[PDB]
Amino acid sequence: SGTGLGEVDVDTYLSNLQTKTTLSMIADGLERSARDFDAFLEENVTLEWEAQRKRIYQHFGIK
Amino acid sequence: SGTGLGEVDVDTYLSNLQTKTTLSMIADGLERSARDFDAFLEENVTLEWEAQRKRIYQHFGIK
Amino acid sequence: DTTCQTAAMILLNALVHTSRASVDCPIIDALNRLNFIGVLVDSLKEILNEWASPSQQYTSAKLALLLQLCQTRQGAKYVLQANLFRALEQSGVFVVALERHYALLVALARVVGAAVTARGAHNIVQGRKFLTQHRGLVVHVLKKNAILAQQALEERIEELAEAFMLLITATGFLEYE
Amino acid sequence: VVALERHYALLVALARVVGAAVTARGAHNIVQGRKFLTQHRGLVVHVLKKNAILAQQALEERIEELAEAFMLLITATGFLEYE
């Protein structure tokens, strides 16, 4: 068989390839930014007062 | 019939009466406070700018 | 006592309410001389711990009273001097269970909203800090509004959303951008 | 459920920018942080109390980040001392 079976055309094939590459780039950038932010927060919070920062509020505010 | 059918005793009857009166008083006070606040807001907002106050935000903030 | 303090708190609401109908009032003035407004604003701290239940209904009358004093022009003077902005910050407060949660936020928002728009440009400086320091939270409420328990919950959102909106237009946060 | 998740994503982004800014310089920016929490009080209280299938976990995750975002500003700004 052949000549077309749930297939696409080259003009649309290249467009789909470019769209997929762009989406993958955006997703990778977002994931890297999120990971960098998480690492920064972990480095800044691991110094001290890990649970006290929330305990003070749980004691002040309504539990 | 008689001598008791899903009934209560006088010692509990008076307590239930007092509890009902207290609950009704609290509910009436809350409702009157809410009505007074609503009337005050209606009197203060009916002056002018009834829809503009929200339109400015809908235009500034994300709809 | 649990019932005496509740009835006494609600009683003061009727006194100040009926007195205004009779721009000043001698009842509100007496409360300031007796150091009642001072200790009252101090109790606002740790309100989360206090908040059908007897403690819940008691707090309702408490915040309800403060809301009335912020409606008269003279109340802004005595109320503002109590430094209520710093009292509500230490507490960290900022289907039926959720409805009660918004009921508390509305009560606090109304007291602050009416207070800023009471005196004039002397309190707008504080209102901007409250919205800027707690930005984002109000944005979620203003966008949410834009069976019995459901309607009751949504009703509080409408009141809560409209509460902050009054403070914005009254404080002039749009000019700050 | 997906629409709400995107809403919190915006609030988190803004909260992080403001949270990190106040705790960056020092006591010169704490005066502004207190006004932001006092002027927008109540809204943050709802988030800090909420945290205390795929789309559900994603939505709750943003609440945890959003709730912890303001908490960092509080301890860094010193709003507890103001009471």
DSSP labels, A32-51: HHHHHHHHHHHHHHSSS-SS
Contact list in D for residue C146 (CB cut-off 8 A) is: none
| Angstrom distance (rounded) from CA D71 to CA D78 | 11
DSSP 8-state assignment for residue A61: S
Q: Within a 10 A sphere around the Cβ of B27, how many other Cβ atoms?
A: 11
| Angstrom distance (rounded) from CA C69 to CA C111 | 9
Residue with tokens 């990778």: A28
| Angstrom distance (rounded) from CA C143 to CA D74 | 25
Could you tell me if D62 and D12 are in contact, meaning their C-beta atoms sit under 8 angstroms apart?
yes
Phi/psi of residue D55, nearest 5 degrees:
-65, -30
- Tell me whether residues C92 and A63 touch, CB distance under 8 A: no
Q: What is the resolution of this structure in A?
A: 23.0
Which residue among C47, C50, C92 places its CB closest to the CB of A57? C92
Tell me which method was used to determine the 3D structure.
cryo-EM
Which residue among C112, C128, C141 places its CB closest to the CB of D41? C112
Which residue among A45, A49, A57 places its CB closest to the CB of D48? A57
Q: Which chains touch B (3 or more CB pairs under 8 A)?
A: C
Contact list in A for residue D80 (CB cut-off 8 A) is: 56, 60
Contact list in C for residue B38 (CB cut-off 8 A) is: none
Q: For residue D36, what are the β-bridge partners?
A: C133
Nearest CA in chain B to C63: B33
Q: For the stretch C48-82, what's the b/e string if a residue is b when 16 or more beta carbons lie within 10 angstroms of its beta carbon? A: beebeeeeebbbbbbbbbbbbbbbbebbbebbbeb
Closest to C135 in 3D by CA, of B53, D33, D3, D23: D33
